Amino acid sequence: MYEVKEFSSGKRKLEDYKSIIGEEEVSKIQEKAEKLKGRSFVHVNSTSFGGGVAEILHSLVPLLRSIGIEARWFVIEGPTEFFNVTKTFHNALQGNESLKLTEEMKELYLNVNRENSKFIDLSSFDYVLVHDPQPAALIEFYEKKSPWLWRCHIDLSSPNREFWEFLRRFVEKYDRYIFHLPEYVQPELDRNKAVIMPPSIDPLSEKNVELKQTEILRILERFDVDPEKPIITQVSRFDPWKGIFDVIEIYRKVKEKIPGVQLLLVGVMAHDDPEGWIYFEKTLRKIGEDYDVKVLTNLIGVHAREVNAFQRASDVILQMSIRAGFGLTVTEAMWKGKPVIGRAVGGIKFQIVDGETGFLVRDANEAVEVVLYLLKHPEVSKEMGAKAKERVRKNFIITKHMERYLDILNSL
């Protein structure tokens, strides 16, 4: 078990968002953090590099620090055989009931947890937070002296029975279990001690920071995207259930009345995800030689800062997922003042206030209607965008995230 001590984000402090959330709120935050001044608030997880959770901590910890809370972050060390197992665990908890949990696995998992537990005494801290499966087992390698929290960043509505009965021996121990949505909260747990904490976006990260027009245009020009013509965009992983083919249909139908429209299919996927890459090849083959459709991914060098650009340069953003988690991509768009059009699924129905900040549609043709409405009425779009931005400022910002945590430490 290692510690971060540092933070890529830098010396993030509540103050760095004063301009964004206003002083009344900066205060309301500081206040709720006084009652917890000098307390120990540690975070444990499986990596400080790859991942959003990791990216969230690099900003979240510093913040907690600069507000009066001795926040600290520790990571878990392990051999490949441990992460491949946790990958399975991961995929198992998120359905895929074709996975088998063996003893060689439980032993490995539990052992790795034992070892990393003898490096730093976690029971000593006023508050301990454990992120995702990998370090769940930790909770039974110390005598509890303070509350322990389980943070879930995945779906637990339809988990592989075998695997859940095993993890549940650890999760049930913690004082409160935190989930993104009131759907991931397995029944084997006591809803009284469960907590709903949607994830959040950090306004000052590569993905959400405000770029300067010149850079947006450099990126637009680099990937051959015309900022002078209309643009619709769906940022998302490439898989069978993200509505990607529907989007392609929507773009085509819209293109009948607006021949200049361009479609941006944006998406960063890890190299160890053949599933995603096969759906990627499939997309391109369906798109055919229509270069008004841009398929942008990290294979061609698209990353957070470029994704940032594609989103900002967009006139309308889509999210036609058939099955979805929280949908941070929807959150990012909403933050960039863009009106989203998407299916009422997972976190997309929770974030979009239909008719106010964007639209919730049931099919592709309904999505076509609205893409034209919005494209036809830029001022309406501007409005929905402005409201979508506020909703985020007031609900899904990393500072509102922290405040939520505070609310939780003031209820134990």
Taking CB under 6 A as the rule, does residue 41 contact ligand UDP?
Answer: no
Taking CB under 6 A as the rule, does residue 227 contact ligand UDP?
Answer: no
Which CB sits closer to ligand UDP, 325 or 337?
A: 325
Rounded (10°) angle between helices 161-171 and 80-93? 110
Select the residue interacting with ligand UDP from 268, 313, 398, 406 (CB under 6 A).
Answer: 268
Q: Which stretch binds ligand UDP (CB under 6 A): 219-227, 323-331, 371-379, 389-397?
A: 323-331
> Closest residue (Cβ) to ligand UDP?
325
Taking CB under 6 A as the rule, does residue 328 contact ligand UDP?
Answer: yes
CA dihedral 325, 173, 82, 155 (to 10 degrees): -10
- DSSP code, position 212: -
Report helix, strand or coil for 127.
strand
Select the residue interacting with ligand UDP from 267, 342, 358, 385 (CB under 6 A).
Answer: 267
Which tokens hold the place of 32?
């709720």
Q: Which stretch binds ligand UDP (CB under 6 A): 116-124, 324-332, 336-344, 395-403?
A: 324-332
Taking CB under 6 A as the rule, does residue 207 contact ligand UDP?
Answer: yes
Who's near 372: CB < 8 A, 6+ residues apart? 254, 257, 258
Taking CB under 6 A as the rule, does residue 324 contact ligand UDP?
Answer: yes
Give the Cα separation of 343 and 323 in Å (integer): 9
Instruction: Using alpha carbons, list the distances in angstroms from residue 364 to 86, 318, 324.
Output: 37, 11, 17
Which CB sits closer to ligand UDP, 267 or 339?
A: 267
Q: Which stretch binds ligand UDP (CB under 6 A): 32-40, 215-223, 231-239, 357-365?
A: 231-239
Which CB sits closer to ligand UDP, 42 or 341?
A: 341
Taking CB under 6 A as the rule, does residue 262 contact ligand UDP?
Answer: no
Give the Cα separation of 145 and 124 in Å (integer): 7
Taking CB under 6 A as the rule, does residue 203 contact ligand UDP?
Answer: no
Q: Which stretch binds ligand UDP (CB under 6 A): 35-43, 64-72, 181-189, 319-327?
A: 319-327
Q: Which stretch binds ligand UDP (CB under 6 A): 145-153, 233-241, 384-392, 397-405?
A: 233-241
Taking CB under 6 A as the rule, does residue 343 contact ligand UDP?
Answer: no
Q: Please state the closest distance from residue 235 (CB atom) to ligand UDP, in A.
A: 6
Cβ density class 53-74: b for 16+ within 10 Å, e for less = bbbbbbbbbbbbbbbbbbbbbb
Sheet hosting strand 262-267, strand order edge to edge: 293-297, 262-267, 231-235, 316-319, 340-343, 358-361
Taking CB under 6 A as the rule, does residue 276 contact ligand UDP?
Answer: no
Q: Residue 76 carries which side chain, given as an amino acid letter?
A: I
Beta bridge partners of 166: none
Chain residues that interact with ligand UDP, rule: CB under 6 A? 52, 207, 235-237, 267-268, 307, 324-329
